[PDB]
Amino acid sequence: YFQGNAVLTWNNEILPNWEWCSRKVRDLWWQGIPPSVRGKVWSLAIGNELNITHELFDICLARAKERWEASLELIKLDISRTFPNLCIFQQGGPYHDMLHSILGAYTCYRPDVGYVQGMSFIAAVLILNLDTADAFIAFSNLLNKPCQMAFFRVDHGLMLTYFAAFEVFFEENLPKLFAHFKKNNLTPDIYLIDWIFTLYSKSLPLDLACRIWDVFCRDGEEFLFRTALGILKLFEDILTKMDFIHMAQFLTRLPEDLPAEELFASIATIQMQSRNKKWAQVLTALQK
């Protein structure tokens, strides 16, 4: 084990010993979790603080199916553009009905939230890796996390404190690009919101997003902001030659072939510590 056979190492060595933070395990986790293992790790990491049951899922789906105004219009449109190169989530594909089911069931569970654009991408990633009811558990609980909540709710107060913490680490790690952004009025709301809200599932190709989700499962919300800084560092040279408009355009539609190994190398060089304070203490200080 830990001799280059990841599936066996995860299944035979790691998961029996879930209760995670071994140094050897953490290096392997950085490389991405095998697809056959992801569902189990993600479900465990995301958890079920909402205490959602399969029976709740069944009922909510039943209500959605009964219900089938412009909400379903938004669901259907978003589904049409969800990882469309794969042709698996779109109508006639083998995950389409499952995708519809998660989203419809969710609008019946939280009818006050309803459908928010980008949600299809989050649900799609989960249904590829989890059975539908378990995917619904993960989806619902993921949307409940402090970070995702802040980045979806109409009141922007909590989101501002995330922006502020993000900027502490941005200036720390990338002082020159930070200044360049400041001079050009390139504020976090231009690009960061979709990145953080969908955990990059709307912003990056599927396989790379999944690897980001893996390490998010290891390190929590801080990894999402570390990733954001990794992307900026990866493109720092080209960004620095752009004005406001070109930066905004580049950042809101990232390269389709964004190379995973190069992004991860860049993310690795980002340190989420400033003045010997970590992400959680910087954020808590900004919230308190």
Side-chain angles (χ1 to χ4, degrees), residues 1-12 14-17 21 25-39 41-65 68-72 74-151 154-157 159-252 254-255 258-260 263-274 276 279-287:
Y1 300 133
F2 304 92
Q3 303 300 321
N5 207 317
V7 178
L8 294 188
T9 300
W10 276 96
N11 282 334
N12 301 352
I14 300 173
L15 286 181
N17 298 280
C21 63
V25 174
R26 291 174 63 81
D27 306 318
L28 192 65
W29 202 323
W30 195 268
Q31 306 304 317
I33 301 178
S36 71
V37 180
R38 269 179 174 141
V41 172
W42 288 357
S43 58
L44 288 167
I46 291 166
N48 193 13
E49 73 176 322
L50 294 177
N51 289 123
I52 295 170
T53 60
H54 286 201
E55 183 186 8
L56 183 60
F57 174 62
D58 292 338
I59 301 169
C60 287
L61 184 46
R63 292 206 279 253
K65 282 175 187 180
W68 302 332
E69 204 158 288
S71 160
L72 188 63
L74 286 202
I75 291 170
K76 287 158 163 176
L77 178 153
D78 250 11
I79 289 169
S80 303
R81 63 157 183 171
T82 301
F83 306 111
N85 64 308
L86 300 184
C87 312
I88 57 176
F89 301 113
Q90 286 66 56
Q91 188 172 261
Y95 288 94
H96 183 73
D97 287 342
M98 291 167 55
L99 188 49
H100 253 285
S101 299
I102 299 289
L103 301 172
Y106 191 80
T107 76
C108 288
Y109 168 58
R110 295 299 303 249
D112 59 316
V113 174
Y115 184 75
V116 185
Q117 274 187 338
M119 273 183 179
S120 63
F121 297 86
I122 302 166
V125 171
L126 288 167
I127 65 173
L128 276 169
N129 291 283
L130 283 173
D131 288 307
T132 308
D134 290 331
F136 179 81
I137 290 170
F139 178 77
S140 302
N141 284 276
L142 196 50
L143 292 170
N144 201 56
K145 300 286 190 181
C147 187
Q148 282 46 63
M149 280 290 298
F151 283 75
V154 72
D155 190 304
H156 286 356
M159 190 171 70
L160 293 199
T161 70
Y162 277 99
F163 287 177
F166 168 73
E167 292 187 334
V168 167
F169 299 104
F170 190 173
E171 177 172 12
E172 175 71 40
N173 285 280
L174 300 171
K176 283 180 184 282
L177 190 64
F178 185 79
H180 179 69
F181 279 27
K182 287 281 163 190
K183 185 181 167 172
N184 287 285
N185 210 6
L186 204 299
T187 49
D189 56 294
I190 300 307
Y191 59 90
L192 202 49
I193 299 168
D194 284 326
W195 289 4
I196 299 302
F197 171 57
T198 65
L199 297 81
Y200 296 90
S201 57
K202 191 163 77 189
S203 303
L204 293 179
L206 179 62
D207 291 351
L208 178 49
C210 291
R211 186 163 171 207
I212 288 155
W213 285 39
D214 295 343
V215 188
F216 164 82
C217 286
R218 195 191 81 183
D219 293 353
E221 65 178 13
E222 79 152 62
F223 186 75
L224 299 179
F225 297 92
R226 198 187 183 177
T227 297
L229 294 170
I231 294 161
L232 297 179
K233 179 164 187 172
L234 175 67
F235 300 113
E236 179 182 3
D237 292 337
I238 65 179
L239 289 167
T240 300
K241 303 199 172 219
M242 287 166 199
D243 67 340
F244 172 66
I245 297 175
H246 289 65
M247 287 194 289
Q249 299 327 309
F250 179 87
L251 292 170
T252 57
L254 288 166
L258 205 160
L263 181 53
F264 271 74
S266 175
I267 297 168
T269 69
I270 303 299
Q271 302 316 308
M272 298 301 292
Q273 182 182 295
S274 205
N276 300 290
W279 168 267
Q281 46 214 165
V282 164
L283 184 64
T284 301
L286 286 160
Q287 287 174 328

